Amino acid sequence: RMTIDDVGRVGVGTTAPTSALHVIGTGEVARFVTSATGGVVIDSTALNYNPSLIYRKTNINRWSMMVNAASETGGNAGSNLSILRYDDTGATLGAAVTIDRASGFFGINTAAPAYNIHVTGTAGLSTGSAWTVA
Amino acid sequence: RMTIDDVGRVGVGTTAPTSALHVIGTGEVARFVTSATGGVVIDSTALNYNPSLIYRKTNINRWSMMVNAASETGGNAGSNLSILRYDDTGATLGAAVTIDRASGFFGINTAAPAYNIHVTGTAGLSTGSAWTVA
Amino acid sequence: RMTIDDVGRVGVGTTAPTSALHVIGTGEVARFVTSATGGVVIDSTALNYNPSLIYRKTNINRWSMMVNAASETGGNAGSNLSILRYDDTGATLGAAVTIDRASGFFGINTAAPAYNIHVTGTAGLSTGSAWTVA
């Protein structure tokens, strides 16, 4: 059920691990329970590396939420959040969503959003053509 | 503290692990660091098994971000990214957000987004009633 | 490159574990594979402890997806979903995205969205000034 490879890779549910930690399971594979506000951290060793949460089917890329390598030039620039989609073979089809760290601007199909919501494409509303002035 | 049960469930910080990996902590329960792009890869062994990140409170479903089981019919159709909300007992309230993998279309309360942003219901904007022509 | 220490924290690839589980690897780092719909669960032990997925860079907060601190007072109130952003020194900068658990309302820069999409700020659309009635 659990093995440790010569290079240094820990496999749970498998004897041939592919990652540092490789867990095989049914249903809830891993459960991380905290006695306080917190959870799982995805960290990087350098600001030019991208911490990613990657959703795969049949080990083929499908979706991912990551912190991109936009450089931190000062004033909270760079390291923005992006939700990326991938084709049926695992090659990136582009950032579906991008949130800028410094401004919080939410871009749909937009790499550099200049508005609080910035949509590049078409917009559909089920109830009318105008926003409601909140 | 660390325990390896007979069925094959590794419990870190607990003796009765319910998942294949079951980690218990305070604050930072788990930390996954990368030296490139990666961190947490959620994979499934078949195209009709949905890889999910599940947020729970007192072991009751609150939220989830997953790749749904929409049929991959070709041309990057299917396997879309859904964010789901659950009621106070943990039962699903529906996909609050759905992004199409083929198109990148972003549906808010819209299971079949037809526009780059597609909202079903009301739209509220603090700064007026129209989109700014970008 | 796998140790257990006094406080019983398991570290993989490190010998100084700082969390209950601490993994560092080249690339993927941790892969959770499920044989059925399921994946990783982040849980808490009380309704006021908030499960979170925290993206850091050099162990400094950059982004967050977490169940927020709104009080569960009945009718699926409270414990909304939040995408938070942090400044260059890891301090909270603001909740970019907030989804109401009870209503599914999607607020951009709005902690209590009162519309299916509630935007506090400006809105830019590439194709025009108006929604397309769906």
Residue numbers in the entry:
A (entry chain C), B (entry chain A), C (entry chain B): 648 to 781
Mind quoting what the paper says about this structure?
A C-terminal region (amino acids 632–922) of Bd3182 confirmed the predicted chaperone and protease activity of the S74 domain, yielding the expected two bands, with self-cleavage at catalytic residue S782. We generated three different forms of the mature ‘tip’ region of family member Bd3182 (we describe the 1.1 Å form herein). Each face of the β-helix is formed from multiple chains, resulting in an intertwined structure. The RMSDs indicate that Bd3182 is a true S74 member, with a surface cleft similar to that of others, whose exposure (via S74 proteolysis) is necessary to bind their O-antigen ligand. An AlphaFold18 model of full-length Bd3182 reveals that trimerization is retained along its entirety, generating a fibre ~550 Å long. Thus, predatory bacterial MAT protein Bd3182 is related to phage adhesins but uses a distinctly longer fold with a more exposed binding cleft.
Bdellovibrio bacteriovorus is a bacterium that preys upon a wide range of other Gram-negative bacteria, entering their periplasm and consuming them from within. Proteomic and structural analyses of vesicle contents reveal several fibre-like proteins, which we name the mosaic adhesive trimer (MAT) superfamily, and show localization on the predator surface before prey encounter. Structural studies reveal a variety of domain usages (and therefore binding capabilities) at the fibre C-termini, placing these on intertwined trimeric β-prisms. Using independent but complementary approaches, we identified and characterized a MAT superfamily of trimeric fibre proteins with diverse adhesive tips, able to fulfil the long-sought-after role of multiplicity of molecular recognition and handling of diverse epitopes (across a wide prey range), by the bacterial predator B. bacteriovorus.
